[PDB]
Design an enzyme around this catalytic site. Sequence first.
Site, PDB file in Angstrom:
ATOM      1  N   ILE A 285       0.791  -1.302  -0.076  1.00 62.06           N
ATOM      2  CA  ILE A 285       0.001   0.022  -0.035  1.00 62.06           C
ATOM      3  C   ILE A 285       0.874   1.255   0.096  1.00 62.06           C
ATOM      4  O   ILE A 285       0.484   2.252  -0.487  1.00 62.06           O
ATOM      5  CB  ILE A 285      -1.012  -0.012   1.103  1.00 62.06           C
ATOM      6  CG1 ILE A 285      -1.974   1.209   0.858  1.00 62.06           C
ATOM      7  CG2 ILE A 285      -0.499   0.191   2.363  1.00 62.06           C
ATOM      8  CD1 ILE A 285      -2.911   1.012  -0.233  1.00 62.06           C
ATOM      9  N   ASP A 286       1.905   1.194   0.786  1.00 63.14           N
ATOM     10  CA  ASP A 286       2.842   2.617   0.669  1.00 63.14           C
ATOM     11  C   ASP A 286       4.104   2.110   1.331  1.00 63.14           C
ATOM     12  O   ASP A 286       4.391   0.985   1.664  1.00 63.14           O
ATOM     13  CB  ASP A 286       2.123   3.784   1.412  1.00 63.14           C
ATOM     14  CG  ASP A 286       1.973   3.697   3.201  1.00 63.14           C
ATOM     15  OD1 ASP A 286       2.270   2.462   3.731  1.00 63.14           O
ATOM     16  OD2 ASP A 286       1.141   4.689   3.630  1.00 63.14           O
TER      17      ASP A 286
END
Lengths: 221, 51
Positions: free
Chosen positions: A70-71
């Site tokens: 996701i990040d």
Amino acid sequence: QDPMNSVTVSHAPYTITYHDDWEPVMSQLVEFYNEVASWLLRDETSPIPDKFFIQLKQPLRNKRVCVCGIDPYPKDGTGVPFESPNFTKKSIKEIASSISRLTGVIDYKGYNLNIIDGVIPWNYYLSCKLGETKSHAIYWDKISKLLLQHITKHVSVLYCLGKTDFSNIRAKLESGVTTIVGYHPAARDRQFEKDRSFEIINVLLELDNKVPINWAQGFIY
Amino acid sequence: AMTSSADLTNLKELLSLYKSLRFSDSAAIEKYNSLVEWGTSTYWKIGVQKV
């Protein structure tokens, strides 16, 4: 002559350097990054601004799989998704375990998804505020879609880690791609331990008459 | 679910069927198209079609 190009934006890091395969998205990356970089640079970032886009140097045309988180790591992000050069981070160590089990390589010192032929590791959001996961989501939104769209034109299989993070991924893409959504390596109940995504990807590749991924190439000895 | 041993078992069977592609009866063929349709729905798109 050189596969590397460079374009200029009006906020740090000022210059984005890329491989030719990324050309068709640059005019818009530049345009979108200029309207948000200001807000985003207010907080301190993982990774640093100068590392945000280093994974735009990676060719796409030889890529069969995209392994997507996701990040970045909330700390020590190098701009290379998943990468922990000292072999420190839990996610990469857990992933190194899954592939020790699969391949039977038992003695190893590191593991990096970014050296594996056919694989491109990716972060849906290119930064976060230090220590805080998903803090820059609202800033990266348009870019993150743009970029992941481009990647999925090249790859046969998109593999996302984060059932809750990625439960709405198909909404974020125009045209279909083989998409598998797995458990985060820090999911509860050791669920990622019994998650067989690495094997599932290879079978799916064979079905799209592609060559499977050699997961062992990621090892650092 | 998509990530389980069962998921991997079904894709292997789909793969093995796709390779021979000589169906002897109408439940072999139906198994194949049922797998294909399951694969397609679970992973959005896969590289084999119904026959």
